[PDB]
Amino acid sequence: NSIQIGGLFPRGADQEYSAFRVGMVQFSTSEFRLTPHIDNLEVANSFAVTNAFCSQFSRGVYAIFGFYDKKSVNTITSFCGTLHVSFITPSFPTDGTHPFVIQMRPDLKGALLSLIEYYQWDKFAYLYDSDRGLSTLQAVLDSAAEKKWQVTAINVGNINNDKKDETYRSLFQDLELKKERRVILDCER
Amino acid sequence: NSIQIGGLFPRGADQEYSAFRVGMVQFSTSEFRLTPHIDNLEVANSFAVTNAFCSQFSRGVYAIFGFYDKKSVNTITSFCGTLHVSFITPSFPTDGTHPFVIQMRPDLKGALLSLIEYYQWDKFAYLYDSDRGLSTLQAVLDSAAEKKWQVTAINVGNINNDKKDETYRSLFQDLELKKERRVILDCERDKVNDIVDQVITIGKHVKGYHYIIANLGFTDGDLLKIQFGGAEVSGFQIVDYDDSLVSKFIERWSTLEEKEYPGAHTATIKYTSALTYDAVQVMTEAFRNLRKQRIEISRRGNAGDCLANPAVPWGQGVEIERALKQVQVEGLSGNIKFDQNGKRINYTINIMELKTNGPRKIGYWSEVDKMVLTE
């Protein structure tokens, strides 16, 4: 019993792939074996992702495990929905109800909003990164209307890294006009 | 000289296509003729857009004119960049620097921020729609930190339309906790009318309220309703009907048969449609500057499958880009110019206010002069 599956790992996902390998070993049985076809492509590039998908599809896979970015996510959700191909991903949850997509990452939106009320915050700064979608940003903004919060949302993402210092100094300069002492960092590791 | 091009029109773009046709006629020359291959697909669906692109690519086109959504935009920008295919679109500008993409719509982000300071706003509500990307939302939020504003951003987009009433009542209920009297409507020509209608119903269109329509089509929507209400309404207009150029266009547009040209028998025109017409002119002047420059780029309908791996970009595409981006003519949307990326430059956006006698230009906005009032 040989079940061929696809593997879309973004270049740099070393520990992710290492964990992917360990899983293959820990969950290997005699009843059937999984045959991973690994494709290391720039997850951000929508075009490349399209090829890697059609390539793994022509190879005749039963399911696909990979990752997507805020840019290529629409490509995956669309193709997998049209071709009825299942796509398992640890990446951020899709903003909606897209069939044929299995998401390993639980929604943090709920846990965050609950924590804010616990500490009883009414005025805080929200530094966000547009990498995982503004799904959580909209969450805090919409709740800011109901719970009546004074949120200071600032996109800390588009900061060019080859001179990113006069930007941070000018960042906490605005976070001092209102003497912001409570900051929420919505970013990657 | 037959130049084949692709046309991706979303189902429902009647006036846009009608304007696309009129452009084909007004800018048709004996030197060369453009052969549009029209494909009507659901622009939102990323998959469909991928097929329509590869289909027009296998047919061997030199350039593609169409539209994209906040969902399919990444597909276009990506493929057009990999296959070196030029893509002209009136849709919202891309959030970044994506090559091989020509954008007819100027950036409103600048004109909006300038208008806010003009009226000297410090606390306002910002009703936005996630359809054209949160590019402008981030703009006002980031500026709210520097200029110190108390913005109340509310996504008026995800509102389910088959019961959208207990939502609006609960919407202006939150806009009453802080007694918000200054609202900015960042929506499409449709979502705006829905809001405007609700505003009149609840009576929040009387003196004391101030609305700002955050789009390039201020006169594109019905204003006769919130015109006599009392509340001041401002917005932006890209199609200056005072230009003899535009005035002449309407003279022929308003007369066209509405049967053959759907939604074309009016004295006005949606900015999206006006950009479509100006798009044709840009593509014409571009392919013309290639003939006079003695540049051979011609090919056949055998570019092959777009999914070809490895994917090899045809060098003739690099020249087609340097052509469109080099174009500089006069159209309905003022002076048309581009930079190395594709974003329009040296343009003018008229600031509009709604008075008793109707809309009236109170000034303009230049990318280099900011806001300038006309006495």
Curated annotation (Swiss-Prot), chain A:
Regarding how it is modified after translation, the entry says: Palmitoylated. Depalmitoylated upon L-glutamate stimulation. Ubiquitinated by RNF167, leading to its degradation.
Keyword Ligase present in the record's keywords: the answer is: no
Tell me what induces its expression.
Down-regulated in the pyramidal cell layer of CA1 in the hippocampus by global ischemia.
In its UniProt record, a GO molecular function of this protein is: immunoglobulin binding
Its predominant location is: membrane
The answer to whether the entry has keyword Transmembrane helix is yes
Miscellaneous comment in the UniProt entry for this protein? The postsynaptic actions of L-glutamate are mediated by a variety of receptors that are named according to their selective agonists. This receptor binds AMPA (quisqualate) > L-glutamate > kainate.
Complex and partners:
Homotetramer or heterotetramer of pore-forming glutamate receptor subunits. Tetramers may be formed by the dimerization of dimers. May interact with MPP4. Forms a ternary complex with GRIP1 and CSPG4. Interacts with ATAD1 in an ATP-dependent manner. ATAD1-catalyzed ATP hydrolysis disrupts binding to ATAD1 and to GRIP1 and leads to AMPAR complex disassembly. Interacts with GRIP2. Interacts with GRIP1. Interacts with NSF via its C-terminus. Interacts with CACNG2, PICK1 and GRIP2. Interacts with GRIA1 and SYNDIG1. Part of a complex containing GRIA2, NSF and NAPA and/or NAPB.
- Task performed by this protein: Ionotropic glutamate receptor that functions as a ligand-gated cation channel, gated by L-glutamate and glutamatergic agonists such as alpha-amino-3-hydroxy-5-methyl-4-isoxazolepropionic acid (AMPA), quisqualic acid, and kainic acid. L-glutamate acts as an excitatory neurotransmitter at many synapses in the central nervous system and plays an important role in fast excitatory synaptic transmission.
What family does the database annotate? Belongs to the glutamate-gated ion channel (TC 1.A.10.1) family. GRIA2 subfamily.
Please report the name of this protein according to its UniProt entry: Glutamate receptor 2
**What organism is listed for this UniProt entry?**
Rattus norvegicus
Q: What is the lineage of its organism?
A: Eukaryota, Metazoa, Chordata, Craniata, Vertebrata
Q: Gene name on record?
A: Gria2
